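Protein data:
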Amino acid sequence: HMNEFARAKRALEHSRRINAGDLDAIIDLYAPDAVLEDPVGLPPVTGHDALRAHYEPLLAAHLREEAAEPVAGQDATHALIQISSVMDYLPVGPLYAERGWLKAPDAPGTARIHRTAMLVIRMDASGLIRHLKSYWGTSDLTVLG
């Protein structure tokens, strides 16, 4: 069903829809009970409702992603891909700064956050995402400006 080539392109399609900014087109890639961990280590996010509330503040920050070449593997359900992200410091930045993940900038209205992350995406035979794990921490976060 979802072979090596299709699994790789579906990973890049996800990052493409993130850049497009249309929430409904993003949620359409997820199964109704899909689990998101962003980042791994914090409580997971389950369901389309919760996925919408997770992405809305990021889209409002004009999140843009530069995807690397994905890895498909032999398993017929997974795809791994490295993502380099940039977004407005507001509105999520203060949440990160209050956790100690970055230092607050002198001009939050104009500052920007860069991030590098590793995605582990598990899809079903239909191609919908059932589980997405994003790995990143303090050392992968940088405040610009």
